[PDB]
Structures are given as C-alpha cells and as structure tokens.
Amino acid sequence: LEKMASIDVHLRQLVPGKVSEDDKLVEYDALLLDRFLDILQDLHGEDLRETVQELYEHSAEYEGKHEPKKLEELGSVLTSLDPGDSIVIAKAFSHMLNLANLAEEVQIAYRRRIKKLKKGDFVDESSATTESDLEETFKKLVGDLNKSPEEIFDALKNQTVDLVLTAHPTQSVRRSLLQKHGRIRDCLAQLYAKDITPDDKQELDEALQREIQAAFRTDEIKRTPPTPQDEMRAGMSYFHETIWKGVPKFLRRVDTALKNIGIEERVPYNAPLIQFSSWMGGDRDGNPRVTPEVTRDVCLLARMMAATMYFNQIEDLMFEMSMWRCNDELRARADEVHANSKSIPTTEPYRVILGDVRDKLYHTRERAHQLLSNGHSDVPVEATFINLEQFLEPLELCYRSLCSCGDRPIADGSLLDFLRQVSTFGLSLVRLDIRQESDRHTDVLDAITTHLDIGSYREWSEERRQEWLLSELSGKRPLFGSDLPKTEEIADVLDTFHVIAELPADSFGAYIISMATAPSDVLAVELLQRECRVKQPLRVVPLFEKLADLEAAPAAVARLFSVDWYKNRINGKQEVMIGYSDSGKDAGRLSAAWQLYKAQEELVKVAKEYGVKLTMFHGRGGTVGRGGGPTHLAILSQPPDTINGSLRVTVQGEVIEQSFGEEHLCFRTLQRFTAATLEHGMRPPISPKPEWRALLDEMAVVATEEYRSVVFQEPRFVEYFRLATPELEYGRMNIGSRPSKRKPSGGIESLRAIPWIFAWTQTRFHLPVWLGFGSAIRHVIEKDVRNLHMLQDMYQHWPFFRVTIDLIEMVFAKGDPGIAALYDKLLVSEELWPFGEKLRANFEETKKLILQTAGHKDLLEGDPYLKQRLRLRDSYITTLNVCQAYTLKRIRDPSYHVTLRPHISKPAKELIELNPTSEYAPGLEDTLILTMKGIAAGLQNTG
Amino acid sequence: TTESDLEETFKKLVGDLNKSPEEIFDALKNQTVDLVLTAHPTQSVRRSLLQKHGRIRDCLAQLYAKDITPDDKQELDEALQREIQAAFRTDEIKRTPPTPQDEMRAGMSYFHETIWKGVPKFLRRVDTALKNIGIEERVPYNAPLIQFSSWMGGDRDGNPRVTPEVTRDVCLLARMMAATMYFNQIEDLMFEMSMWRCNDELRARADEVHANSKSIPTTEPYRVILGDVRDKLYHTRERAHQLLSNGHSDVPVEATFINLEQFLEP
Amino acid sequence: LELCYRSLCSCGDRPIADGSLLDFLRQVSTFGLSLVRLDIRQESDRHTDVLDAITTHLDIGSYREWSEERRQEWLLSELSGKRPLFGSDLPKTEEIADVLDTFHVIAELPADSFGAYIISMATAPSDVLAVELLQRECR
C-alpha cells in the first residue's frame, strides 16, 4: 500500500511553496485523502480505488500545466464507465472536494496572523492574514485619525450590523452532513496537537476514518425539494451551531477591546450592535411555494426556537444565581412570585424571579407549538411574554440588584450574556422580511379600480397613480371587502397581508418590493398594508434592479420623502435595497458596480436633504458577499456616509458555512463586520478624482454595449446558452425551491439571476461576471496611451475600483477556457463552434487586460494563500467538470453509444438503486446532480 | 505519579507473568467493578457550588495554557475572580437537613458531570489497550465491567428518615434521570445514523415501524428504529414523572421499556 | 328521519310511520333547531345616531340634518356601491358601539335563530333602508 507516495508528490506539486510555515494544508488534505481512498477501496474494491486515484492525479497535473492531453485522458477514462461506476466516481470526487474544503477551513482558522506583513494602507484589509482585528481597528482610529475613545464608544453604541439569512440557491447540505464535517474538522485539529498521547492519537485516527466513511455512506438526493419550512430549519441550524453562543462572546471581546484603550464601561446590553433577519418563509419573488401559511409557519417556528433556547439557558442561569444579598425591589418582587405560586426558597430571590421567567418561557414554547400544530391554543396571554419588554424587565431587575450589592462581577457573567442574548435575538431570533414583485401589487390595485368602476390602475400614468394613491391614503373609508373578484395571485397577496396583520410585529422586518421602479409601487404597498388592517405596518423597501431603475431611484426616493403622509409614516428612517447580481444580469457587471456607487452617493444626498436616516441593504452578488477578508475592504470601499452606523447585508447560503460553521469563523465574521462598519463610519474612503468618474462613465457605456450586444442582440445566443451550459437541467431538477424563470417562454430577461450566474459558473467560464470589461479597457487604452496608468492608479488607490477588479481577477482564477471548450465540443452544434471560440478569445483578452490593470503578471499575484487554496479545490473540480460534460452528452443524446467497461463493486442494496422513479438512464440523473453539487460547492461564489 | 495505567498493567501481565493476551481479554470480559455511592457523612455540597468549583478549575487550567492570547487570558482572569466571588457570596446553611431525595439528586449530579460520558470513553480505551497487545475484538458492549449502586434512599440503619416512600421516590427519580439521559443522547445518535445500506432484518423492521407510525423517511432505516426507541424513551420518562409526582399513571407500560432486553434489542 | 318515513311507508308500515316518527318529524319542522326565532328590536333614532356619526366622520354633512328624501338618496347610493363604509377607526359612543356590536353578533350566528329586525318608532323609509345598509355593511 504505497499509493500514498504518489498522491503526496502530486499535492506537493500543486502547492509548491509555503505561504508561511504553519502551512500544513498539504499534510491535511493528503491525510484526509489517503484515509478516504482506503475507505473507498474497502467499500467499492481495489480497481475502483486505482481508477479514482489515477483520475485525481491527472486532474492535478492538468491544474498544474494545463496540457489538453490530461483532459482527454480524463475523458477517455470517464466515458468508459457504466453509470454505476460513474456514480461512484462522481460521489468520490464530491466527498474528496468536501474534505479539501475542510482541510482549508482548519488551515485558515488555525493560521496565526503575522503583524509584520501589514503595509500600512487599505490593501491589508483584503485578507484575513493582514486584516485588522477589533483592537487594531481601535488603535488605527485613535492614532491616525486623532479620534477619542469616547467617540469610538458612542459610535459602537449606535452602530447596528443587521445580517439577513436567505435560502440556499442550490444544495443546502443536510444538517447531518454538516455535523459529520464538523466532527472531521475537530478530529483533524486535535490530531495536530503538538503534545498528544499515542492512544489519544490512535483513537482520533480511528474516529476520523469512522466519520469519513460515515459521511460517504449517506445519500445526497431523493425525498422532496425540501419544503420552505425544512429549508428554514436547515437555515436556523447555525443558531444552535455557533451564533447563539457566539454573540455574547464577541460582545465580551468588544468590552475587552474597549478596556484596552481606556474605556471603563461595557457596551450596554440592550444596544443593538448585532441583529439577525430572515428571508426564509418570506421571499415570494418568483416562488409560488412560499404561501401565506408558509409565512405563519416560519414565524411561529422562530418563536418556538427562541423560547426553547431561553428555557434551556435559564436553568444554568438559575444555578449561577445562588446569591442572597439583594435589592429591596427584587426582594419585594420575590415575595410576590413566591406567594402567588427543590422548590425555590425565598432566601434565593434571584432564583425566584428566574424560576417565574422559566415558567413563562416553557408556557410560551408549548403555546407556540400549539399555535403551529393546530391553529388555536388554550394558553391565555398572561402565561407568556408577548413583547421583549416583559421579558427584559425582571432580568434587568436582577442586574440592578446585583450591582446594588456590589456583585457587578457576578452580574457581568452569566446574567450579562443572557441579557445580551435577549437584546440581540429578541423573541424570534430573526425578523422575517416579506418580498414580492411590484407587478402583483399593481394587479391587485387594477382589480380594485376595475371593480370600483374608476378605470384601470394599470393604464394610469405614474403621476395619476400617485394621485389616486394619495387621495385613498388620505380618506377615512376602507377600500374593499370579501366581494371582490380575486385571482389566485391576488388572493395570495391579500391573504399574505392578512397573515401579517394577525401576527406579532416582533417577527417582521421589511416589506421588500422587487422590480421597484417608481414611488407608486411603494405607496401602493403602504396602502394595501393599511387597508388589510396591518396594525403596525412594516417599513417599505424598494429594490431597484435594472440599470434605469438605479438611474431614476434617487428621484423616486426624493419624491417619496416630499410626500407628507409618507414622510411622517417612515419616521425619519428609510431602507433601500440594491442588487449587484440583479443589475449585472441587466447591464453587465462593470456598469452595475459603478452605477451602484453613484446611486448610493445620490441616495445619501437625498437623505441628507430630507433629514432621513438611510440604510443600504446589500443584496446577493456583491463584493460584501464574498465572505472573509475581502468583505473588510469591500465594506470600507462603499461611498462615504452610505453606512452611517447601520449595515445590512445578505448572508448567502453558499457562504453561511464559511461564515458561521465554526467558533473562530463566527467570531472573525462578527468582528470584521463590526470593525468595518465602525472604521468606514469614521474614516471614509478617498473621494474619487473627477477624471476617474468620467473614465468609469465611458467604460460603463462601452461595457453595457458589448454585454447587451452579446446576451440580447445576438440571435443564436440563447441556443448557445441552452447548449454549452446545463441551464435547463438545473431548471428541471430537485436542486432549488424556485423556478429558474419568471415566464417559461422568455429569453434571458425573464431568466432569474441565480440560474444565470450558476449556469456559466458550472462550466468554468463565468461569462456574466467578466463580460464587458474587455471592450471597455481596450477602448480606453486605445483612446489614450495614458489611461492605462490612470487605471493602474485607481486599482492601487481607490478602494472601490480595487475591490471590483480583485473580484474579477479571482473569478478568472476559478475559470478555465479549455474545460469550456470541452463542453462546446461535446454539446454544441458545429456551426455554432466559432461563436464560442470568439467568446473564449474575449475571455483571454479580458484576463490579460485585468492583469495589466492590477500590475500583476500572474493571477492573484498578491494573494498566494488564496491561489494555493483555489488550486487545491480546482484539482478536484476539473474531474467533476469533465464527468459532467460527458454525462450531459449521454443524457441529451440517446443515439451516442459508448464502449462500456465492466462494473466494479457493491428496496436498494447498491448505489444505482437509490433512484427508482428516474426519467433518464439509470444513474445518469444522479451523476449529473452530483457533479452540479460538487462543482457548485468547489467554486463557491463568483458574481 | 508512579501507579500503572491500563496498558502498563497489561504489559506487566504479559511480560512478567507469561499470561497470554487471550487470557487477559477473557478475564476482562468476566470482570465486574461495582461501585456503590453513599450519602455524605456531613455536607453533601450544593450542586450549584459543585458547578462553581468546576468553573474555577476550568479557569485555572485554561489560564495556565502555554499558548494563550492576551485577551483570552484577561477574560479568563475576569471569569476566575467573578466566579470566586460568586461562590463566596452564597450561603451554605438554612432550609432543612435536605430530604433524602435532595441528597440523592445531589448524589446523581456526578452522572451528568462526568460518569455518563466517562464510561464509554474508558471502555474505548480498554479496547485500544487490547489492540496494542494483539487482541482484535473489543470488550463486548453488554459485558458489565463497570456497575453503579446506591445506598441513597435505601440505607435505614439508624435512620428513621428513610421511609418506604423515600425508597419509591429515589427509585422513580433514578429511572427519570436515566430515561432523560437516553432521550437526550438518541437525538445525536439519530443524526449520526444517516446511512441507507442495511440488513434485510433491519429493513423489514423499519418497514414495520414506519407503517405503524422531517417525518423519518423509509430510506433512512436506522433513523426509523432509533426514532421509535426515542418515542419509547420519552413515554418512559413522562410515565416515571407521573408515578412519582402522583402515584398512578395513564401511560400504558407497553409504550415504555420495562426491562433492559427490550431496550437493547433494536 | 324522512328517509325512515319513506322506508316504513315503502314496507306498508305507514301506521307505524304515523306514530312516534310523525310526531317527531312535526316537532322538528315546528321547532327547528332553536325552538324559537329571536327578533331584534331597536329605536330608529339609534340607527340615525350611527349614520350621523358616520357622515360626520366622512365629512359629508350630518345624516340627521338631512331631509327625508336626501337621506333616501344617500342610503340608495351607498347600498348601490361596492365600497365598504367604515372600519375600527370610528368615534363610537357607548350606544353606537352597542348597535354595531349587536349587528356583528347577528353576523356571527346561524340565521336559524333570527326572525325579524323590528324598528321601534318607525316613521319613514329611510329608517328601514338605514337598517338594511347597517346590516350589509356589518357583514
């Protein structure tokens, strides 16, 4: 058994140098890989193991030198496998890749930071090795900006970081397989303790193998495209995993950091530095499966999870709180609770109060399980806490008392962590946002005006809409009753509003209007809210998606503030949502990014005019959605005063593991969010030179021209897209809960942005992310010999431009034109081949231009850590690519017969039997799904 | 400091006494250690003060880690002082000479603290020691190498306060703590058991259990069986709380495990 | 029951059917599910109070000052339209609350219990149309 000698060599060639000398990543992945291959040999035989290993060796050699021979050898081996062995190979490379991501997680989390590698400028904030922690951010604010610690302390007091969890665009992996990955990480880490005992080490190795097999022996398909509730619990897994415990530890570190610069107070417990929001069960844009009952469901489920967690916590709090000296107030309250009732003696008053609150917690949990599992309950209102204040009051009483008796140290222990968990998590953990297209609201209003015989709200001009909406919001007469012809959709909208009306506001964040374009969409949602008897209406949030919507958004927002009814309803607070990927699908990426910068600038000018406090909600696709070090500089790179102590970011499902799976991970996440928000608030990035703004305007025009000319003006583009890319299969298979298009018969316009990105990400081509940069940079470079220098100035001195280019370069590192060409060769008509060839030429050109801008000669020249990690994942992703290409060829072409090879080794008793009701050949559907999940998992995020 | 551990004891048995590893393994199979817990001759300390001492120990130990970070060390010191005051600021008298049941719970604290997790860890270490001398089997799971007994609620010698009702109390309280621990354990056992290849015997039983019933899908049979065992555990615990807090129950005995065999079988 | 009667007469047991079964059927038809049917009765002036509060809250005038025919006209246009008339945001005296809540209680019950809505001191068609409108707009 000396296969280990070979893969070790290959790994050491993939990652040759050392990015430090704790660089045990090759050791980690070689260990996990060898254990895995042994388990694969034991389960599925020797031949299978040798085949898979040969495949990986070739894939790694290809990632090394990129000789197309390696690709054709991988193809040669993969075509000869009967679908059973294809399944085994695909599953093999999925698990090997996951193990690679695991060794990476351990490497990053236990990489010790190097103080001496900092340069002194903003660049350092784009990598976790040189990014500032909380304390370094404090000292940078004090020394360099002459800010006083009191100003920092206030800034922290009023700052709010609101993280919004969304559903996974593809495989939200089984909570069980997450658990198994966790055990594997812990085993690795403990195995690399520099002191461990021989038996501890032996039992750790045994546990590791045991769990790698345990993970391999579980399916990753079948069942349902899990219902919105199942996805929602699968979302809240990370509250038990890390977040619930993680909040108070982070806040305590904020206290320590404040002490270490002279501040003697702590951050007040009720200060909302962290906040969590959810879309799971609320977003309806192009998702009929999110019914009103779904919303009522995840609302009550959230309240259940909250009351449960508080209940399990308050036992340990009651144990801790065994003191007897207390305030007179708390003493009287204890006499009250005891009279109105181990049995909690009156000499332990803290335990009396906390025992009563414990009662209220249990009663609330059972009441919520009865409201969800039935539709009514018997539990009266008084056995439960209805708002957060009733909950907070007795705890704050206990804190007051403890500090009264000089037991503040005791009060700053379990009690403080509990109070902060109550303030951060509320009664619901999260606040659910509802989201819906504007056109559905317009449908409802049109049905209403037609039923009232006033015209059709749809035909009305934007201002006429505004006028009718204003008169209707003014009056005292309700608008409709049950006697209204309601389509299924109209009924969905109205019933959603009623469900909102019949629930506590503690669960609801914002009403987000997708495809928002004009003030009438916002006023419309406000009116529907009031006329559906929504007691405390939600804040309305427009989502300007298309480019023109971004150009006209400040004018619409100003017009909204200028309206007295809205000006008083919003109460000096406004939240606007931007979508990096949504605008990118419309007008290319460069134009969408620059337009977003300008649009935020103008929105801030409007908010300063009308004296409203603006919060910018960053959707998916952004720079702030990459996760990790890059998020630091990305947040720093927002236009000045666009943050102002209120950040709101989408936590994409594809990153939620890299952000909240582990302890160190969650801590560093909350830390970089808080530090970035604070520093940007007190130290805005430089304002751009005007020549820069003009240059970006020209490049935006050229880029949008090329982008739309390719995606929309070329007629055969959609045929090419359907051929060279698994878009249709993703649209058909039980991968995501949402349909891939809004209208089945439309082109790319009606296609959603998630399948648009995902489709081209799968083929290692990434056309939506970089398309447009080539023609623009070429254009300005030819226009003047000097512009290049100017561009290179921006990349090195303008944070915004730097984070944009950096993202593009990183995506190019995840790309490979040769693999794309393989997809073309197997799946595209011959008369369409040159088309693709031309695109690929563009690809290469764009790459060479991006490099020239960054002053780099290789991709990711400045970040060799990331280069190493990407190289390592890629060596696994490439085989999944080829396997996917040929599998597509077989699925689409029943006339393409292959020369099969003999089967290898072992109602379902073998891997091929796990899909009975299959449409295509046995095991092809599952292989395609496997490669899609594996490639998608190995590439993570791009654009 | 110089006493023999398990493995050194093995090598002393094998090298010096010419005992075969098989003889050692058999001896272990048949050996039983029955540890009997008694009430404290004086202060059986409050379970809360146990917890506080525990936090103090953890704080000391982590404070003397040869790698610790400045902020971790500062927060550790703060936690240490905080907990020392916390312990000092609690009384240790009043109330009653705690009822035999109160002393009995205060005895069973140590199952949660260490013993419940500690037993299988030790047994696994016995397995490792057997591997290192050539034995490929493990110590059978149903072998009673460790056994626990109690006098708390049973010893009456010179003690009028141990009434028969006290005995029935500590009996049912013990069973409650047992069913509790098993229940809380079997959730993580159900998470682990997500495999799909299974025995024909297990397949048939799973088809049966699912037919007689997240909703436990039939292609995860282990989760079917263990979810059923979870059901019986819950019913047993609630039944014991009803027999203790009342004197009767409505929950039928057949919804619960009555003997160790019904429990072990699935 | 009628099935049992049909059957008995089918087998020529009509005499048996005309005994306890017939008395039972007649008791069901005479007494229904409620023995009696409850009439509601109220002064017309209370309905006028409610309509006056509504027209004042809508800033249209005071239904009270309006002549009998003008009342008739507003009542007719309102009974014609498709828009409801008011919501919880309405200044309601104790009496107005009594009237509206009475109408809601009528709405939340089976019609088997209710006979007639009787207007005491009835004087003009607007009193009747008014009660009809309040009935509809109270669902």
From Swiss-Prot, chain A:
EC annotation from Swiss-Prot or TrEMBL: 4.1.1.31
Catalytic activity: oxaloacetate + phosphate = phosphoenolpyruvate + hydrogencarbonate
Any one GO molecular function term: phosphoenolpyruvate carboxylase activity
GO cellular component terms, A-Z: apoplast; cytosol; nucleus
Regulation: By light-reversible phosphorylation. Activated by inorganic phosphate (Pi) deprivation and glucose 6-phosphate. Inhibited by L-malate and L-aspartate.
List of residues that carry Phosphoserine: 6, 687
pH relationship of activity: Optimum pH is 8-9.
Cofactor note: Magnesium. Can also use manganese.
Gene3D superfamilies tied to this protein: Phosphoenolpyruvate/pyruvate domain
Main location: cytoplasm
Induction summary: Upon inorganic phosphate (Pi) deprivation.
GO biological process terms held by the UniProt record: carbon fixation; cellular response to phosphate starvation; leaf development; photosynthesis; protein tetramerization; tricarboxylic acid cycle
Residue positions of the active site: 168, 585
Function as written in the Swiss-Prot or TrEMBL entry: Through the carboxylation of phosphoenolpyruvate (PEP) it forms oxaloacetate, a four-carbon dicarboxylic acid source for the tricarboxylic acid cycle. Contributes probably to the adaptation to inorganic phosphate (Pi) deprivation.
Entry-linked HAMAP family: PEPcase_type1
Family as reported in the entry's similarity comment: Belongs to the PEPCase type 1 family.
Name recorded for this polypeptide: Phosphoenolpyruvate carboxylase 1
Species for this entry: Arabidopsis thaliana (Mouse-ear cress)
From Swiss-Prot, chain B:
Top-rank taxon, per record: Eukaryota
Post-translational modification: Enhanced activity by phosphorylation at pH 7.3 by lowering Km and sensitivity to inhibition by L-malate and L-aspartate, while enhancing activation by glucose 6-phosphate.
Localization in the cell: Cytoplasm
Free-text tissue specificity from the UniProt record: Expressed in all plant organs, with higher levels in roots.
Induction, as annotated: Upon inorganic phosphate (Pi) deprivation.
Active-site residue numbers: 40
Family listed: Belongs to the PEPCase type 1 family.
Quaternary context: Homotetramer.
Function: Through the carboxylation of phosphoenolpyruvate (PEP) it forms oxaloacetate, a four-carbon dicarboxylic acid source for the tricarboxylic acid cycle. Contributes probably to the adaptation to inorganic phosphate (Pi) deprivation.
The protein, known as: Phosphoenolpyruvate carboxylase 1
Encoding gene per record: PPC1
Full-sequence portion shown in this chain: 134 to 411 of 967
